[PDB]
């Protein structure tokens, strides 16, 4: 059994604003590698909810690889361009009934772009 395998009825997906790097520990400033003060701001608010069991980062890169894996071949015409997908956290609720509450509080976290239940 693996951690990234969560049942449909208890999964909430939390999409991160495209200009927030919640999973990046360091960023570039003045040519140096320095602390990202916004690191895990969204992660921690989700992890602090009493009804959530796990929160796992899913990058936009990873989401596109899996899409090409599940559907046919890569989507060649977009290969030169930026990835338009959103980084996301995959949140596991403690019970199905907690999902609607989790998704509502999640949209109120600053940095959260959208939440899918
Ligand atoms: C409105 C929704 C339409 C969006 C469809 C876009 C498909 C994403 C392809 C990204 C490939 C870029 N690449 C190679 C760097 C990962």
Residue numbers in the entry: 49 to 165
Text taken from the publication that reported this structure:
FtsEX comprises a cell division-regulating integral membrane protein (FtsX) and a cytoplasmic ATPase (FtsE) that resembles an ATP-binding cassette (ABC) transporter. Hydrolysis causes a conformational change that is transmitted through the membrane via FtsX, an integral membrane protein with two extracellular loops (ECLs), denoted the large (ECL1) and small (ECL2) loops. The folded structure (residues 57 to 166) reveals a central core composed of a four-stranded antiparallel β-sheet (β1, β6, β4, and β5) and two helices (α1 and α3), an α-helical lobe (residues 107 to 135) harboring the α2 helix, and an extended β-hairpin (β2 and β3). The helical lobe mediates a physical interaction with the peptidoglycan hydrolase PcsB via the coiled-coil domain of PcsB (PscBCC).
Three different structures, with resolutions ranging from 2.0 to 2.3 Å, were solved by X-ray crystallography, each in the presence of a different detergent. The detergents used were dodecyltrimethylammonium chloride (detergent 1 [D1]), n-undecyl-β-d-maltoside (detergent 2 [D2]), and n-decyl-β-d-maltoside (detergent 3 [D3]). In all cases, two independent protein molecules are present in the asymmetric unit, arranged in such a way as to keep hydrophobic residues from their α-helical lobes buried. Different conformations were observed for the β-hairpin and the helical lobe among the six structures, depending on the presence and identity of the detergent molecule bound to FtsXECL1. In any case, the crystal structures suggest that changes in the protein backbone and side chains of the helical lobe occur when a detergent ligand is bound. These changes create a cavity in which the detergent molecules insert, with a large part of the helical lobe (from Q111 to E127) affected by the interaction with detergent. Residues Y112, W123, E127, and F126 are strongly perturbed upon detergent ligand binding, with the hydroxyl moiety of Y112 interacting with carboxylate of E127. Changes in W123 and F126 stabilize the hydrophobic region of detergent 1. Full stabilization of the hydrophobic tail of the detergents is completed by the same hydrophobic residues (W123 and F126) but from a symmetry-related molecule. Although a physiological role for detergent binding to the helical lobe is unknown, many of these same residues are important for the interaction with PcsB (see below).
